[PDB]
Tab-separated table of C-alpha atoms and ligand atoms in Angstrom:
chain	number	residue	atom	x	y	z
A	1	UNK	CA	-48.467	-3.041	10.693
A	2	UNK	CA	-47.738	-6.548	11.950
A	3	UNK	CA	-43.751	-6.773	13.637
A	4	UNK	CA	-42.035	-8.745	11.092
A	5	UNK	CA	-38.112	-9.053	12.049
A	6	UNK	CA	-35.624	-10.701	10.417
A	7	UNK	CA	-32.108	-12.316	12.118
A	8	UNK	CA	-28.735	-10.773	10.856
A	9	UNK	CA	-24.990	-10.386	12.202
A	10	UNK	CA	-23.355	-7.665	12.673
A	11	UNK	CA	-18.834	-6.734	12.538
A	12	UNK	CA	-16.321	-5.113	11.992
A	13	UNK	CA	-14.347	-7.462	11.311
A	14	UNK	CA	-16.337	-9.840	9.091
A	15	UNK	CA	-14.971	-12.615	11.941
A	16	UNK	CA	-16.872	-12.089	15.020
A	17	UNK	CA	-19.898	-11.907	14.087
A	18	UNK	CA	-23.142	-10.425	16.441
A	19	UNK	CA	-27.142	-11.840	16.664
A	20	UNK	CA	-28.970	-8.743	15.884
A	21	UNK	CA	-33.009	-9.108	15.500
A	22	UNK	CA	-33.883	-6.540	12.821
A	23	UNK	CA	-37.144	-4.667	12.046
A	24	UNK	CA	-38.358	-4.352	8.841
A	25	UNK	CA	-40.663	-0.829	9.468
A	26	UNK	CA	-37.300	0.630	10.192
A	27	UNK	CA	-34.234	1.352	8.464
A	28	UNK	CA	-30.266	-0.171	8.676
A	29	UNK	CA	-30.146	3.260	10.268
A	30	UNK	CA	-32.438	3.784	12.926
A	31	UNK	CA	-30.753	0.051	14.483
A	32	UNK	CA	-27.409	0.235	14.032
A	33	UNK	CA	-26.401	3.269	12.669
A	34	UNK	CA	-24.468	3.484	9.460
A	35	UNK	CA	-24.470	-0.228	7.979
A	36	UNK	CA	-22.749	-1.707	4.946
A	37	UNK	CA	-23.498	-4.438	3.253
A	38	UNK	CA	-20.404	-5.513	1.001
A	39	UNK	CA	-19.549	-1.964	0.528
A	40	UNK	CA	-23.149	-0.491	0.052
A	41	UNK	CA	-24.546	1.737	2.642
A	42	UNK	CA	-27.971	-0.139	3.714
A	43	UNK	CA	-28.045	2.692	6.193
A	44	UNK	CA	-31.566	3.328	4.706
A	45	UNK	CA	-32.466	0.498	2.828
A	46	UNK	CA	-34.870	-1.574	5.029
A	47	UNK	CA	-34.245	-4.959	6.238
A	48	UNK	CA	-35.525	-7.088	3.178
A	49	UNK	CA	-36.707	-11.127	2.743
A	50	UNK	CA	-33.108	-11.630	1.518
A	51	UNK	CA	-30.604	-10.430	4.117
A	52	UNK	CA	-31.331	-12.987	6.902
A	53	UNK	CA	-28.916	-14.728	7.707
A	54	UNK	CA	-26.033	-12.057	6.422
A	55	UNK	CA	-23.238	-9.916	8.199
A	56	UNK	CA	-24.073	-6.531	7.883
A	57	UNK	CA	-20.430	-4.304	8.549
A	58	UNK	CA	-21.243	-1.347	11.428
A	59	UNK	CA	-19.369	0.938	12.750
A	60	UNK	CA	-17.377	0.426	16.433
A	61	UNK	CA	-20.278	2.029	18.475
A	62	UNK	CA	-20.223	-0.190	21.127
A	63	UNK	CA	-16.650	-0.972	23.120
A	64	UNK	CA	-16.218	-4.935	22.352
A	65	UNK	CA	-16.667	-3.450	18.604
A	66	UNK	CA	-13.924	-0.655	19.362
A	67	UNK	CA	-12.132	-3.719	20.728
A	68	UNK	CA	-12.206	-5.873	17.508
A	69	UNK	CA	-11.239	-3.302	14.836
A	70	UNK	CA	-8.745	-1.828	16.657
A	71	UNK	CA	-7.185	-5.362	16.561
A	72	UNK	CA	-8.196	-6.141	13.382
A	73	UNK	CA	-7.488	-2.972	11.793
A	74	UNK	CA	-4.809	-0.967	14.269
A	75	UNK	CA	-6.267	2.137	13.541
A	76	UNK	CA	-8.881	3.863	15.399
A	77	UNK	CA	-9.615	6.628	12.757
A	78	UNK	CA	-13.154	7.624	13.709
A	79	UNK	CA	-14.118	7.249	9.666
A	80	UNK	CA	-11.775	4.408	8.884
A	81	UNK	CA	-14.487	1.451	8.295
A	82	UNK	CA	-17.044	3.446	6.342
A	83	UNK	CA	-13.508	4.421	4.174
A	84	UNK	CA	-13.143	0.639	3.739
A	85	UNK	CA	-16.575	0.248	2.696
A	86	UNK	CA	-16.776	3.134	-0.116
A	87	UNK	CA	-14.073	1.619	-1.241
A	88	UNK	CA	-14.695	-2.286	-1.332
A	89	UNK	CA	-17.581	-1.074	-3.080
A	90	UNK	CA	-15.613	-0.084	-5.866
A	91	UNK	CA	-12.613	-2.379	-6.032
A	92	UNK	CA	-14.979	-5.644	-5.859
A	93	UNK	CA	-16.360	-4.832	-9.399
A	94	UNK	CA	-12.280	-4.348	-10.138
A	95	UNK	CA	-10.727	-7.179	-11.915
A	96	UNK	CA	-7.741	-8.887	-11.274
A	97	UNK	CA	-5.418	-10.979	-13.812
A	98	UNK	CA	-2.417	-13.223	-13.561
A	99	UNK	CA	0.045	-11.345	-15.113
A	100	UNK	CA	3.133	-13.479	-15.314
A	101	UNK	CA	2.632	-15.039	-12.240
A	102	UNK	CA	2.072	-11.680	-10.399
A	103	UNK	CA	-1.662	-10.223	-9.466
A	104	UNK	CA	-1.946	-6.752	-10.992
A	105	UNK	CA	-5.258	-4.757	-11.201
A	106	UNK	CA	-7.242	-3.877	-15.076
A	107	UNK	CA	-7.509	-0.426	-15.593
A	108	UNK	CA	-10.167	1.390	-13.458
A	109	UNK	CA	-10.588	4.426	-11.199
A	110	UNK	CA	-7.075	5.896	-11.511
A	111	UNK	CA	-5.771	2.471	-9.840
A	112	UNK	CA	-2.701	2.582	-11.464
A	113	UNK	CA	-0.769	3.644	-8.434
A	114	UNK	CA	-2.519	0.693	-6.580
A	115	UNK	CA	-1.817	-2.115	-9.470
A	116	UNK	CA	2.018	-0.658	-9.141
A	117	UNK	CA	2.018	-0.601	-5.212
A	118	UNK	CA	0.781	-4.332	-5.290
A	119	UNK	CA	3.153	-5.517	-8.064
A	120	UNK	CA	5.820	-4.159	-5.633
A	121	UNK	CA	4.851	-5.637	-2.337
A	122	UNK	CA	4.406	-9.227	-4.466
A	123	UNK	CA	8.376	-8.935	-5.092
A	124	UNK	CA	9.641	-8.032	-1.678
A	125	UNK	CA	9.710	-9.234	1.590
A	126	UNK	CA	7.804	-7.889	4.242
A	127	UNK	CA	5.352	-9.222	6.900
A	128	UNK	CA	2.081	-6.884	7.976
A	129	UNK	CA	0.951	-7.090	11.393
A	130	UNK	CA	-2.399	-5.338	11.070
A	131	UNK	CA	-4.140	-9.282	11.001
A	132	UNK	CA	-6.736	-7.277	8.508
A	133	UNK	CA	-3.573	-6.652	5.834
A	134	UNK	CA	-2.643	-9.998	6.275
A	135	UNK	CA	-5.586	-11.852	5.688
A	136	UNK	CA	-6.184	-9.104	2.760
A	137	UNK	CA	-2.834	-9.779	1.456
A	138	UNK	CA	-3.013	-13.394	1.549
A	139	UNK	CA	-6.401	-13.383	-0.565
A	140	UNK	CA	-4.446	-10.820	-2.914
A	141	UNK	CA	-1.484	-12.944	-3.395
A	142	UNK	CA	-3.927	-15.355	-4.315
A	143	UNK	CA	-5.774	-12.961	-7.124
A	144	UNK	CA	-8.700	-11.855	-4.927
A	145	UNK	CA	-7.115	-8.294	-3.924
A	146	UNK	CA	-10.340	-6.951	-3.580
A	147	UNK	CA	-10.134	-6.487	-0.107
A	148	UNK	CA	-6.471	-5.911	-0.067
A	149	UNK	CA	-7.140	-2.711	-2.104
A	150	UNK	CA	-9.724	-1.042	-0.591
A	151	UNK	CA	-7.500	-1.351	2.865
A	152	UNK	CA	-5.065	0.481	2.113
A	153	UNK	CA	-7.659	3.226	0.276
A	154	UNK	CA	-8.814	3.051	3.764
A	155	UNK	CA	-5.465	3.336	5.455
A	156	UNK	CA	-3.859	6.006	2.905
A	157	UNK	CA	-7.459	7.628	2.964
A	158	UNK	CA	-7.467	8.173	-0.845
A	159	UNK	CA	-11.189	7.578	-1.955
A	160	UNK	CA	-11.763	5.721	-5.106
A	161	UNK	CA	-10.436	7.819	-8.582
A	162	UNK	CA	-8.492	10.208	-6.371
A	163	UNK	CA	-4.896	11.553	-7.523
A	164	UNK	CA	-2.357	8.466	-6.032
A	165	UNK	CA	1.555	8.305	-5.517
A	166	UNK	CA	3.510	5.088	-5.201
A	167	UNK	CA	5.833	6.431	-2.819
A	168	UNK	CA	3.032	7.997	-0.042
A	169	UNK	CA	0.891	4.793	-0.504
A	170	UNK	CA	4.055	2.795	0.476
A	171	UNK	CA	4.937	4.664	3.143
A	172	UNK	CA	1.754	4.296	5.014
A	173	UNK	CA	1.699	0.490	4.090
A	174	UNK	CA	5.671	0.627	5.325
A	175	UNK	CA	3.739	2.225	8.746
A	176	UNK	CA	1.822	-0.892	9.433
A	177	UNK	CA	4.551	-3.693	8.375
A	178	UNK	CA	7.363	-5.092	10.549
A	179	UNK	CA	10.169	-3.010	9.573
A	180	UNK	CA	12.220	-2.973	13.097
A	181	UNK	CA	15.204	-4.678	12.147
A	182	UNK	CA	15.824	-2.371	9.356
A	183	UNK	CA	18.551	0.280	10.206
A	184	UNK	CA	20.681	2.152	7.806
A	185	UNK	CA	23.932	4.367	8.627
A	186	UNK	CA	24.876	7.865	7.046
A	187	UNK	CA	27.639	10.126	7.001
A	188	UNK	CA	28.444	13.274	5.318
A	189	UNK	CA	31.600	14.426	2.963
A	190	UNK	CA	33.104	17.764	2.197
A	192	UNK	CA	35.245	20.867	4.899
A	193	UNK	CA	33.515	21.853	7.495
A	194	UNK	CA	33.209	18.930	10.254
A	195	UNK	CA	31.328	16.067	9.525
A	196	UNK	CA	27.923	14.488	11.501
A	197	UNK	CA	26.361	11.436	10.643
A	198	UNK	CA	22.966	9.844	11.052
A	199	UNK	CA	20.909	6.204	11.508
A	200	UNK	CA	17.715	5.892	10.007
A	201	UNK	CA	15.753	3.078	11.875
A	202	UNK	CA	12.524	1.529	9.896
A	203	UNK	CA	10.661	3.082	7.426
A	204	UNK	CA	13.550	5.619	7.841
A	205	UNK	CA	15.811	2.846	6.685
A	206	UNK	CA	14.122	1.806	3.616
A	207	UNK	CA	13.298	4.416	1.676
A	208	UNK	CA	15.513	7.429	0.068
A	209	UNK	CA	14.376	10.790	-1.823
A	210	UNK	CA	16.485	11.969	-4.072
A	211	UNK	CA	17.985	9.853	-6.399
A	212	UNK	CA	17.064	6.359	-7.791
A	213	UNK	CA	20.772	4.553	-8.296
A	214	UNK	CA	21.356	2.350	-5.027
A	215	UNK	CA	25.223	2.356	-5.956
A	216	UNK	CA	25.085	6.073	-6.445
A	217	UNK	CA	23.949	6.168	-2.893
A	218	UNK	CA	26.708	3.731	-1.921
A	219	UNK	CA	29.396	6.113	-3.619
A	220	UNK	CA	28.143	9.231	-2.450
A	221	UNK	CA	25.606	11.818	-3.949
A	222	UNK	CA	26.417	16.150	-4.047
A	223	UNK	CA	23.399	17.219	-2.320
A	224	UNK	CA	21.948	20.489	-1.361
A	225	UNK	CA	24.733	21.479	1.156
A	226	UNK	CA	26.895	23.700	0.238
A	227	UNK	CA	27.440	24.728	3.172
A	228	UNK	CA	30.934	25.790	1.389
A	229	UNK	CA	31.606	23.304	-1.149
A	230	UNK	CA	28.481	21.111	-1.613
A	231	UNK	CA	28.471	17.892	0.323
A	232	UNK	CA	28.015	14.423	-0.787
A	233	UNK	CA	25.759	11.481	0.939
A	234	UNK	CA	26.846	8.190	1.650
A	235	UNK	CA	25.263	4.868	2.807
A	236	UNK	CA	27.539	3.365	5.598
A	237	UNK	CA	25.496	0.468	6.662
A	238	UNK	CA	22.462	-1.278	5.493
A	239	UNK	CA	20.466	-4.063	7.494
A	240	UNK	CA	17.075	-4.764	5.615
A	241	UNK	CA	15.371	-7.841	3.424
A	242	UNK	CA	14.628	-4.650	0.467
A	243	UNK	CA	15.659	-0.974	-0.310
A	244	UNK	CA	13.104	1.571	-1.848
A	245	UNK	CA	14.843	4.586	-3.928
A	246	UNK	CA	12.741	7.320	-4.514
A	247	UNK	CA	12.791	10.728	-7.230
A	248	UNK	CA	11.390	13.256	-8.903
A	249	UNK	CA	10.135	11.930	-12.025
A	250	UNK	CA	13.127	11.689	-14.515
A	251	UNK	CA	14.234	9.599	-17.260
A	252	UNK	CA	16.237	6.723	-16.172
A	253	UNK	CA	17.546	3.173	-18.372
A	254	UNK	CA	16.818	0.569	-16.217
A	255	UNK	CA	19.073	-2.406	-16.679
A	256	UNK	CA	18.075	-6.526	-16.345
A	257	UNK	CA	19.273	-8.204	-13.364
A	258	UNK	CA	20.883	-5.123	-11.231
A	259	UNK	CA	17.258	-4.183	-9.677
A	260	UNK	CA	14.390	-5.996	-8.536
A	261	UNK	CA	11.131	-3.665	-9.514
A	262	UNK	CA	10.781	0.185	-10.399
A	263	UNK	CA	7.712	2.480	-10.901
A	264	UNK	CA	7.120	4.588	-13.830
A	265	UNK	CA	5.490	7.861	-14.079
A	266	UNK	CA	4.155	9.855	-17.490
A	267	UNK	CA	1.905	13.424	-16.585
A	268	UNK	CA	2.183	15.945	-14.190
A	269	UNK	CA	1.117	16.762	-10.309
A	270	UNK	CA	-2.618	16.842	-12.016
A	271	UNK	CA	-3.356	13.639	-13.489
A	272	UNK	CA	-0.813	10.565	-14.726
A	273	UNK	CA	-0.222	7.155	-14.964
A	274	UNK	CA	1.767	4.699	-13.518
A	275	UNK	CA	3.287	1.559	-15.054
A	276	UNK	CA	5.389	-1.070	-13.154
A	277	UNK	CA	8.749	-2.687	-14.527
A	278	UNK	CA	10.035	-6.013	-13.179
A	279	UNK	CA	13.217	-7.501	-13.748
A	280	UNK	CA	13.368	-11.550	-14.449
A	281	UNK	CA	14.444	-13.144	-17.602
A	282	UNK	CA	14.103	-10.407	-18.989
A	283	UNK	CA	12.511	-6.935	-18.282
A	284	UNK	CA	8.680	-6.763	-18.120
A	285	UNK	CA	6.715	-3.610	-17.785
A	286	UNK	CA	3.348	-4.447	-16.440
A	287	UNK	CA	0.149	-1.590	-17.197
A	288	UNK	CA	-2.957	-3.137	-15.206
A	289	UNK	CA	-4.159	-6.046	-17.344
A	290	UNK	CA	-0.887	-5.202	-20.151
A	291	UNK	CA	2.080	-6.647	-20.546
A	292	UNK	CA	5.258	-5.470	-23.090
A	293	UNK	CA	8.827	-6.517	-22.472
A	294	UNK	CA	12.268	-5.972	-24.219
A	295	UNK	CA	15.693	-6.340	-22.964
A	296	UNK	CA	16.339	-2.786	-22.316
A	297	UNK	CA	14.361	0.165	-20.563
A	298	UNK	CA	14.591	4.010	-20.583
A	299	UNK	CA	12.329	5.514	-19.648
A	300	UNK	CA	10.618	8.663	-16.582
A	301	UNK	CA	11.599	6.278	-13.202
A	302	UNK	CA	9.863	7.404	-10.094
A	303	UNK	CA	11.013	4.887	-7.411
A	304	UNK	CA	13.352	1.777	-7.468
A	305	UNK	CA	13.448	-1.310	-5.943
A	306	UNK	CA	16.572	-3.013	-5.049
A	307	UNK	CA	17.140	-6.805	-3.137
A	308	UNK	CA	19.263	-6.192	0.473
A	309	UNK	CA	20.385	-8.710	3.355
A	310	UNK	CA	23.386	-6.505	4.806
A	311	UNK	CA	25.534	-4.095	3.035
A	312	UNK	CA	28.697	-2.467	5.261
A	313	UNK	CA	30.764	0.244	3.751
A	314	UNK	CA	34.588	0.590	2.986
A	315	UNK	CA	34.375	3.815	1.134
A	316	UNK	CA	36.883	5.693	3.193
B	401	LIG	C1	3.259	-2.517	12.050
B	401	LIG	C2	2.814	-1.260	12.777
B	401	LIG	C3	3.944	-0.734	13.677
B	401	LIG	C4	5.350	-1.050	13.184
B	401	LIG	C5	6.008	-2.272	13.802
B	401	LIG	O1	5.455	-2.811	14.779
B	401	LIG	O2	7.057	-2.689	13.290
B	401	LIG	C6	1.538	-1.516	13.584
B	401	LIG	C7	1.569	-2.908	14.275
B	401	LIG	C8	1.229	-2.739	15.773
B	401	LIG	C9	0.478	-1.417	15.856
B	401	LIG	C10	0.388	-0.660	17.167
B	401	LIG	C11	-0.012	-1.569	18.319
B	401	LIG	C12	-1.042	-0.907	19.227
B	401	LIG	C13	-0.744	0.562	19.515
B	401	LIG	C14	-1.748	1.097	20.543
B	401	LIG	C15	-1.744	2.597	20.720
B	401	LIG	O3	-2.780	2.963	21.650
B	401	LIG	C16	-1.972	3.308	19.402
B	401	LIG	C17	-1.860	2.376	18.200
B	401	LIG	C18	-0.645	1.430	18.229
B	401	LIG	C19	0.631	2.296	18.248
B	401	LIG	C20	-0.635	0.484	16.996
B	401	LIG	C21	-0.513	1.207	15.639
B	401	LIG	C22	0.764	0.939	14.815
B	401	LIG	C23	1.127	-0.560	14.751
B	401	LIG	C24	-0.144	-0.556	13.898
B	402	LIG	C1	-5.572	23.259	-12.805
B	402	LIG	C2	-5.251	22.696	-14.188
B	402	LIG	C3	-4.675	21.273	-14.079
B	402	LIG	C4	-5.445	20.212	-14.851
B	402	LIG	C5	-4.725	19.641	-16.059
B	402	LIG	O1	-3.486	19.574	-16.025
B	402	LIG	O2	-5.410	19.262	-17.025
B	402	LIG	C6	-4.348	23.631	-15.023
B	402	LIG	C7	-4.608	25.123	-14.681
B	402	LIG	C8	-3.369	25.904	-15.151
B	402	LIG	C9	-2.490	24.839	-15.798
B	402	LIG	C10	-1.013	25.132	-16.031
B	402	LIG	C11	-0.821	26.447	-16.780
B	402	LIG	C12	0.624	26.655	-17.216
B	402	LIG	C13	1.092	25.501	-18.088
B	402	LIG	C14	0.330	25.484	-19.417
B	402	LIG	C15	0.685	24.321	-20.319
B	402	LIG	O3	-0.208	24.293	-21.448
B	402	LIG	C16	0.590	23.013	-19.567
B	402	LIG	C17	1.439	23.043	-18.302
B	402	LIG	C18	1.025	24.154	-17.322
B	402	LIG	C19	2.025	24.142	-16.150
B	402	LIG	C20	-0.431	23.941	-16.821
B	402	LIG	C21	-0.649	22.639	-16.047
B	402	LIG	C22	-2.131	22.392	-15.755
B	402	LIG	C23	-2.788	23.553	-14.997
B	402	LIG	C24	-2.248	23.639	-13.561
B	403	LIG	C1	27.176	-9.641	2.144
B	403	LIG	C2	26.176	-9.301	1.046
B	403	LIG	C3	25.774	-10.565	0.267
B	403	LIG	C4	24.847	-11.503	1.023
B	403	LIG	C5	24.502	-12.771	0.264
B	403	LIG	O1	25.436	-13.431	-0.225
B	403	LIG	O2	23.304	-13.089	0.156
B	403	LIG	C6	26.689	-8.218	0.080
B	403	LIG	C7	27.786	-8.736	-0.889
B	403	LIG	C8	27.303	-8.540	-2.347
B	403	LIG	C9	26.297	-7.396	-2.302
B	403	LIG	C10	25.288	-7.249	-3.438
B	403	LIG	C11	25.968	-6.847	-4.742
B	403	LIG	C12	25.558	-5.450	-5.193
B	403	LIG	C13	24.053	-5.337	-5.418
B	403	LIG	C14	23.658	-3.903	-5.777
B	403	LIG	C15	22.192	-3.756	-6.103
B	403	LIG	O3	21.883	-2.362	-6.280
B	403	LIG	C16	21.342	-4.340	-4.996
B	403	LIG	C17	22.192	-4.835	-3.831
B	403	LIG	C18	23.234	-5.899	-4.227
B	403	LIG	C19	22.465	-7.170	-4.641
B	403	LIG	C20	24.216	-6.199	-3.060
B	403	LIG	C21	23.522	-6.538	-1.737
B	403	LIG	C22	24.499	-6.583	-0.558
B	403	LIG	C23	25.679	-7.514	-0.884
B	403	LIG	C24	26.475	-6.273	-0.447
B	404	LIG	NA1	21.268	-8.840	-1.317
């Protein structure tokens, strides 16, 4: 019956933080809305002895809090914070080894996807400008991808457990990288004219259809016969990586000629993922596991191969 408040900070950001004086007869809620502490909803849990002091996470209600996450974040999806909170929830009690060098995620939640997708962005360069992915990134590169993961949860707006792909997930971390000077060149082979393309960006980095880089390079048949089945060729690539992308068959991947590839063992309802790098030999990385041999075969998904600047001579 006495007013007892407490002091506390609220974000979006977890930077700039915001003097809030809290009441202690009333709820997270009835204040400031839905509120997150760490990833739990304190939305109803009343302002205790113990949170003084603390950022509580809110959501941009305001204007100068629309103004932060949309810089932090670059997304102004009306559910995107509570998304990352959900999530952090989870992926904080995730762990996190050194596995040769690399930071891959244990086992947990139908992560595999995620433990793959971060194996992958560890071996290739790219640059995020989102300054939320790379801070996240940074601390993930650094073992503590908590954060990192439940981002791009938020951004690819799986929820924790749900069914993941490798190749979705890296498109919409693709979206928010810089991937401008990337450009690729295409042109089309056999009668009947012939019209060519050039893919800019994402566009220009990623491929469905067939895994083999040099099979792109020499040409593929594809779904064209528009009277005699035509065949696809690469003409020009300008980009730091290239990102070939399948239906899940079996493929032998072979030391030194790639960079990383993604495995895939199921169906369209339920699977798992494991991640092969190539170094001194060829490493195949399952959450906290770790095999190797000299040789793979095995049900390839996606491929990744190392690029600077390819230009064409065939024909
Ligand atoms: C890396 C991504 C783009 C690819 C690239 O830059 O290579 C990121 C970086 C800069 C971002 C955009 C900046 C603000 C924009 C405001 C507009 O009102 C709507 C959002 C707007 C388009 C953002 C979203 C996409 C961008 C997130
Ligand atoms: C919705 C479910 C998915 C969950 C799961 O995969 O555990 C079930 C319902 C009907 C099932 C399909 C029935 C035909 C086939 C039978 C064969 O023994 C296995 C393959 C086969 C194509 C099934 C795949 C799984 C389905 C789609
Ligand atoms: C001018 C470029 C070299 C730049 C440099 O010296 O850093 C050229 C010359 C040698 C080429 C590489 C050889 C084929 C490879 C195929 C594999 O599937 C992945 C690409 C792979 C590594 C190519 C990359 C582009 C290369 C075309
Ligand atoms: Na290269």
């Amino acid at each position: 019956m006495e007013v007892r408040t407490i002091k506390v900070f609220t974000t979006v950001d977890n930077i700039n933080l915001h003097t809030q004086v809290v009441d202690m007869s009333m709820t997270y809620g009835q204040q400031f809305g839905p509120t997150y502490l760490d990833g739990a909803d304190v939305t109803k849990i009343k302002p205790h002895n113990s949170h003084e002091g603390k950022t509580f996470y809110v959501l941009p209600n305001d204007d100068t809090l629309r103004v932060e996450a949309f810089e932090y974040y670059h997304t102004t999806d009306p559910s995107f914070l509570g998304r990352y909170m959900s999530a952090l929830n989870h992926t904080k009690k995730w762990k996190y080894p050194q596995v040769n060098g690399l930071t891959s995620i244990k086992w947990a939640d139908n992560n595999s996807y995620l433990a793959t997708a971060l194996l992958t962005l560890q071996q290739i360069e790219l640059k995020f400008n989102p300054p939320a992915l790379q801070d996240a990134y940074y601390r993930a590169r650094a073992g503590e991808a908590a954060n990192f993961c439940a981002l791009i949860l938020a951004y690819c707006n799986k929820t924790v457990g749900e069914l993941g792909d490798v190749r979705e997930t890296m498109s919409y971390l693709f979206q928010h990288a810089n991937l401008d000077s990337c450009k690729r060149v295409l042109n089309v082979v056999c009668t009947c004219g012939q019209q060519q393309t050039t893919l800019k960006g994402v566009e220009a980095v990623m491929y469905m259809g067939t895994l083999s880089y040099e099979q792109f390079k020499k040409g593929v048949q594809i779904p064209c016969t528009c009277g005699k089945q035509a065949t696809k060729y690469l003409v020009q690539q300008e980009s730091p990586f290239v990102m070939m992308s399948a239906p899940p068959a079996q493929y032998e991947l072979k030391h030194g000629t790639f960079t990383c590839a993604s495995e895939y063992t199921g169906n369209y309802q339920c699977g798992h993922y494991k991640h092969i790098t190539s170094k001194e030999t060829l490493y195949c990385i399952d959450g906290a596991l770790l095999t190797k041999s000299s040789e793979y075969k095995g049900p390839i998904t996606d491929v990744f191969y190392k690029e600077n600047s390819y230009t064409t001579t065939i024909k």
